[PDB]
Design a protein around this nucleic acid. Structure first.
Length: 237
RNA sequence: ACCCGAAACCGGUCGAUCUAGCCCGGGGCAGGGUGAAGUCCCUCAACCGAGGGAUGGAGGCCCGCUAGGGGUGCUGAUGUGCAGUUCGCUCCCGUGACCCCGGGCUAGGGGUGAAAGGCCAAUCGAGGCCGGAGAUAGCUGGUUCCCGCCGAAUCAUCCCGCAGGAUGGCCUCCCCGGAGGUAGGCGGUGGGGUAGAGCACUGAUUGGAGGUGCAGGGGGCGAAAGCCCCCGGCCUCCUGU
RNA sequence: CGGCCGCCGAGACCCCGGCGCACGGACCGAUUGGUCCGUGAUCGGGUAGGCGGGCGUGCCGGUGGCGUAGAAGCCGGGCCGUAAGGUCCGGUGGAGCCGCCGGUAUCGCGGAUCCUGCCGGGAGUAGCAGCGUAGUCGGGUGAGAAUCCCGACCGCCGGAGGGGCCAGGGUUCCACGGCAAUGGUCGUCAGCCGUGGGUUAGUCGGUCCUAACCCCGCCCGUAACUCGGCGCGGGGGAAAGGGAAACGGGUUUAUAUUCCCGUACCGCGGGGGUAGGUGCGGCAACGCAAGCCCGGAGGGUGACGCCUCGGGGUAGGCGGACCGGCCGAUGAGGCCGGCUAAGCGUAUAAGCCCGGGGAGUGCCGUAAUGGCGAGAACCGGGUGAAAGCGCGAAUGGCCCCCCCGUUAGGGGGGUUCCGCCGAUCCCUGGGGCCCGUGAAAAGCCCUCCGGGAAUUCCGAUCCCCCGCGACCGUACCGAGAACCGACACAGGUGCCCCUGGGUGAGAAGCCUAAGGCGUGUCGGGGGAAACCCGGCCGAGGGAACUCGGCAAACUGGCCCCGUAACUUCGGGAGAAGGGGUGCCUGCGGGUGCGUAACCCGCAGGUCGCAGUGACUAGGGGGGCCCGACUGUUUAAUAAAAACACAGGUCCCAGCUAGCCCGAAAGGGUUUGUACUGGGGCCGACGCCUGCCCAGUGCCGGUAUGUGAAGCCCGGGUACAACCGGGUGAAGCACCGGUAAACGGCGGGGGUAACUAUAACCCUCUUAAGGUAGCGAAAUUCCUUGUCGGUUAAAUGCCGACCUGCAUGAAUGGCGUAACGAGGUCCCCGCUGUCCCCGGCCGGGGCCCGGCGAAACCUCUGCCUGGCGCGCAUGCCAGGGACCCCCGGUGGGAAGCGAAGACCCCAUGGAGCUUUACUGCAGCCUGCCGUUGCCACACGGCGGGGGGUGCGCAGCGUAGGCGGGAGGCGUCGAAGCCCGGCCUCCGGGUCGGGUGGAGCCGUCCAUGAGACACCGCCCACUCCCCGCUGUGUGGCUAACCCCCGAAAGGGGGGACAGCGGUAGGUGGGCAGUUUGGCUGGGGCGGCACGCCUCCGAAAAGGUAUCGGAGGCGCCCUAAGGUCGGCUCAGGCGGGUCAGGAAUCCGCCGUAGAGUGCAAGGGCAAAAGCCGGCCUGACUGGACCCGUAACAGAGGCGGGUCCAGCCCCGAAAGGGUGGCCUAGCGAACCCCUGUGCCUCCCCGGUGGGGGCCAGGGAUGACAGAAAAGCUACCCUGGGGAUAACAGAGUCGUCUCGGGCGAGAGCCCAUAUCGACCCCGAGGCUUGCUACCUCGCUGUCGGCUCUUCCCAUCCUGGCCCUGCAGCAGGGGCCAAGGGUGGGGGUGUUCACCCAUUAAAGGGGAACGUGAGCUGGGUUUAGACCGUCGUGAGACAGGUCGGAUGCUAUCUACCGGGGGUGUUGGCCGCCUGAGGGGAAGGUGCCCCUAGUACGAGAGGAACAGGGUGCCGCGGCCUCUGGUCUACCGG
RNA sequence: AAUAGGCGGCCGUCGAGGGCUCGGGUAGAAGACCCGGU
């Protein structure tokens, strides 16, 4: 048989590679040595549209002379001042350790471990809810609905990511979809395994139906995991 | 291993000037129409409202031999062509998912695919070049001077055997051994169950006569113990197979 | 037909002569032999094949020779040899060659669709047309001119055939000298040949920067590398991105932004001054020369998308005036020239600012959006582009005039204004859009920070002057001849960048200026045809054509009225439909200063057939199916209903995740983080999406069973191997969820008979029985279902019903506006599609002069009937034909372009699928190592100790056996009391104390007796020590992950990762298998291993998918022996007792029985009944059968020897079943037995060997093993199917014999049962004889011909024939046998006419004649079947038709010979051809014959239509590229 | 028409008759055919 699209994506060819040269750059926090035990004040210079981010970006210049790129929270104003550190006030756009953030607050850009630079709640329109604070861990409810425990020293930014409601308007046109997916080099348009040939897909065949149940085992080898992978259930409930 | 021919398999290499996809940087698309959002104006009334007039340039919008791109029908010309896919008329898109160019990347069980098993240099249900390699076949074709002597077979058993082999039968050449041999006929000693014929067994087969109540059936007939016939069955004989 | 006579006729038979062969004999050879004689009626064909001899070729060892007085070789002849061949003669040739003996070898050719080279017929033929049809006249050159050169005329392109210039080409560029070859002809010409030349840069480009991306070093992986890779350091990477600087005139045969002249600019360095160091004007925006050098930082610029509009400007264009020139008539008018580069200096517009000012019952402004106390009107100013203006620059260029003109030259004039339009070319601002955000760096400018030098000094971005500026490209084409495609290729690259006037909206079409060309290169002739390609027209009809309106035709621009169903309210829509359109004269209006330019109206006059007059330029409407739309696809037969799409919904994943690449290292998603990344399915929109978890999947659990290695325990082994048990993860077993997961959603009877028929209803049945919708459907076989509409006529289309073979709800159901080169039906209009074809034009065809092939070719080439491998130009018998050439049409050569589309075979392949076989990755998991430290719990071990033992009986709560009736007691005991304790709360054990001297049987009970004492245990449990693991909790120090250059910090953590091993899962990836026979193959069956009867033909043998049946066991008796008896059936007689229970007598040849089929054999037995036994045994020999003759592994059977036995008195018998079926190699393993053996020797454990028995291969003389191919490939097969031929005729079509009868009587007017005999090859089938290195299918169109079994026309006979008509039959093949509807249809059905509207053959006639609707590839949909790939003689949409005629054939046209010398003219007609004619109707006979009436003929006599044929242009119509007019 | 014909006329034992060339169609693909040519 022939390879699948997922199999061909793992080889890193330009058909599947992300065009990470037209983007504004990675959004990570300043190194943790600056933030620990000290509070830094920065000024917002500009708010721009990152080609592939699903969220606006902002440029922040700090008093020590460091220029950084951050994910702009909703309501962030050009020329406003922000603070990062343990002593930062509780306001939108300020970054604090999770131990100093009061319960019931909305946060985003949470570090998985202290100093990694931020890994969670980064998409546009997303926020997480601080639930409980303990000397050993801090519980936050993530956008997926899961309650996750983080180290008290993990950093997060107060507010909600700008760009929410993006899915309220339909894409309408295949041309609109074409531009949207070409901006980030995502495989588009997409074919169907049932209309593929038998050599190409497990579901391929002259008759456009799957010849086997579409729920595939978690232990299936690569080149076989298609359809519903390790599905607990199917259908509409 | 007498000689030539396979489709195919395997190794290492060569190709994205064709074409497919994606990235960086560039060039291009006469003229006309329609009239979305938006911004309004005027009149009569005023508790409602009704009517009229503008501006505005959006669209995978419309007409279009602009350029450029595509290829529906004629199943037209040509069909040892101008051309190893071209020409004419007709037709379709023509501001967009648009067309084209220079620089790059993805390489063969791999790439790429708006998915036709399409495209990857006139080659694609696994590219090309050299090597394994003079590959293999029970299948097709071929196999070069003359005279002389003898001269077949397509029948039995076995094989994943049925277009192929092996053991025998039938042919030919040479040698040992040394007195019998038998294709034809006559007479004799034995064996046989075919043709024909026949009913003595086994099984069929038309009618009639006699015997047998014979566990049969049909009627009449009787409290009930059984009778009277017809038919049927079973034997013998005659008759026709 | 019954006989005879004579002849003729083979290689047969006879005779003479010759050869060889086989055998025997004599004689003679220094290697197979030679000569001669004898016999051959009993020797003489020959494929496969065997054997013997001989001929020829190259070279070696010998031997004997030839040759320049002519070797080899070659050409024509003579002789010899059966022959393969040898040798001579004549000629050419000029240098080597041969006989014999013995060796040796790339040793002998007609084939292999053989290889290489050369040459024929096709052929002096095709081609030199189609998309741009271009030449003519006079002159010149030259041996030579359609083709070369000049002038004139006539033409083509003119948003490209013109101008510029990349890539590519590499000298093709220029001049001179030429035509052997090249150039589609010629050539004096050339992109050709020869000889000489040609490319000049500080400013143009490379060079510099960086983008996507690439390379090198370190590092890591790999057995390793030239292989893979993250991170660090370095470098490269654009001749169209960024990026210092030049523009006119002139010059050469060929270079010029490069050379010369003129005028400039840029970078570096230097010299002399100056500004500044130490300076001013403005409130301000700002104006300014506004210090030098080194280092750093900041800002700006470089620096950016798409759509759209306003403003300013420039090229270019138009009109007018004026001066020169040309034309015109020295009229009017038209045409030509009237030009201005960089650089330097110079400023406004928009935009943005800066002062003053202080508004709203609001003012201000734009094309538009808009702005204002967060500061508007309004008055001043600052900065700020493209341009214009001045110098450059009129000594230059352009135009004109004059003198000299033999060559060569010299001078004089002008080059000026106004108005309008105006870019796609520049500058500058608004506005709008993004789920889309549309590059970086070098470089340059400014500002700011530190540092350095400067006072009789430092010193510029300002002025003047001077010097230097490297390397490489530069010619030419740039394409219908300079590139790629083999080409001077109609393709592609590059149309990549640019465009005067008129008409016109237009970069449209047409004409035309400039520029270019006549080289999209063979010319000439012609009523010079037929026919083909391209174009124009066509009377009357108007789709009657056809699968289908294919093609063509109608409409057409603009203005004004007007515009439907439906709808997603946007659309449909230019729906539909109607009116007008030219020219001239004159007015009015809009913007405008304008009587400049553009645009919009009005009135009148007038001409034609026609006024968007050419050119340009929609035909329209109504239903249905499918897909929402724009878009994409099989480059080269399918553009679609297929794919994509926005939208819906489901699944996985919190990041060291999920999914994926890899051998690993590392990596893609990822500069990402659930509004995200990845994985399915449906597919806009509207309404909806029902039931089922039994099956197959997936997910969770897993108490319990199984479950590998490892570990532990016992046995074994002087140690192991080996055996048994325990622990035992994952996975299965099991349980639960899950269907927008794969799929499924049934089946019988009767009813409610206010008829009949329906579901209310009761019985099996599953996980459940299909809900809403839709339905003869792209799904319906019957089917052309039935009804209604459409037509004269309907296999169509639409509406409806439901009997849904085999619809149905996200493999979605139904509906749907808009959309579509999708399929489909109808209507108006239109037309040469058709009736029915006829004219005209241009190019071919044809002839003449040139260049000049190819496909193909065994040799040839006439027919009828035949034989034949079954459809012959060549054979047999006949018929006919003198020979050659030109033009044409394609019947045949099963013509040419191919080692068969289709089918079968091959122990041949490839792609794909799966619960086929066997494997490899990935994934899950146990164990060992990395791997450490604190505790807790649990499960097993060793050392000890505890309480805890109701079987039934009892003083009593005996568990087991042993010694053992006494043992205990100050070595302190009963009977009293409370405490803890286990406990079947039965009832026992025990600390303390009142207590100070007794307690149990032994005896009997108890299936087994002592709480008499002494011992070992067994059943549960706990605890003290040590060992062992499993799980749980915690820790950091290994290890990992993050931040950081590092230091170090943080997070996880003995997990994970890595290494080794063990089990599972695993079409993700591979190698394979999927048998054979077969009246093709498949399905079926097993004729695939055995036994019996028939076939089978009286010895033996004998086959078929021949006929009739059995076997894959069973029996300790159904085996051995001995003794005794006689069976089945029937008759007669008997208590219950009968048809049948038991008994007596007789007949009784087996009619019974013998285990099981059939055949054979069995009567004092081989049957039945009894006694005794195991010979169904051990060691061996020979023989028969499977398998004749005639080969055999294995197996079966028979005759015996010996041992030990059985029965019998003995003889005698017994090696299974009375005989013929009931079964199986190698290797391996198990068992019995008693011997041999294992590497220097010996012992032990273990292994190997010899003999016997057993476990099975049924495809049974012994592989381990599923499918699709329509994407298919290869080698083959007429050993083998489909089409066609051949054989046959069951079947089909058509007859005949007899006569039961039916016909009022009457068999035969007509029909003719039941039976019987035939003909044809027109239906189908059967066989498999020709054809698989290809013979192209059905239907239709065109065209020719034949048969009669006659539909009509001609003539007759019978009749249940009155007439008109009918029914049946006979002769007769000259003629006719037509037009339409649905359907691909043949056929069949239907419609209106007709004399009738016949059936058949010709390779189911006819594709080198056509068409391509069906069938039968590759794409796609629906239904059904299959787990799946997929399949369906089931529907449905699309899906290629090649040709230069060699021979013959036919149609026409010519040159010759012959016809006993040549020529002209007129005739004859032997033979051949014809249909040259065929057939309706009307009047009259006649309302007559006939007939009751109704009705209704015929002979004869007249007229006329249609079909067919042969002619003609007076009449009519068509055309009329002569001609005339608008 | 292989029995390959009949008749009238002109010619031979220099010469009747004909062809090319010429002007044109009652004809035509080349050939052929038909009229005219002092």
């Amino acid at each position: 048989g022939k390879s699948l699209i997922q199999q061909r994506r793992g080889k890193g060819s330009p058909t599947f590679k992300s065009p990470s040269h037209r983007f504004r750059g990675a959004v990570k926090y300043i190194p943790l040595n600056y933030t620990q035990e000290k509070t830094l004040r920065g000024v917002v210079e500009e708010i721009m549209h990152d080609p592939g981010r699903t969220a606006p970006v902002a440029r922040v210049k700090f008093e020590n002379g460091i220029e950084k790129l951050i994910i702009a929270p909703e309501g962030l104003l050009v020329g406003q001042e922000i603070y990062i550190g343990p002593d930062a006030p509780i306001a939108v756009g300020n970054t604090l350790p999770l131990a100093k953030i009061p319960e019931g607050t909305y946060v985003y850009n949470i570090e998985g471990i202290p100093g990694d630079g931020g890994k969670y709640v980064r998409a546009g329109g997303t926020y997480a809810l601080v639930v409980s604070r303990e000397p050993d861990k801090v519980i936050v409810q993530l956008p997926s609905g899961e309650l996750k425990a983080f180290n008290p020293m993990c950093r997060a930014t107060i507010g909600v990511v700008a760009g929410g409601g993006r899915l309220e308007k339909p894409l309408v046109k295949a041309g609109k979809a074409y531009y949207k997916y070409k901006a980030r080099n995502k495989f588009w348009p997409t074919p169907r395994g049932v209309k593929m040939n038998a050599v190409n897909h497990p579901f391929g065949g002259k008759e456009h139906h799957p010849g086997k149940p579409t729920t595939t085992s978690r232990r299936a080898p690569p080149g076989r995991k298609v359809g519903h992978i390790a599905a607990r259930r199917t259908g509409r409930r």
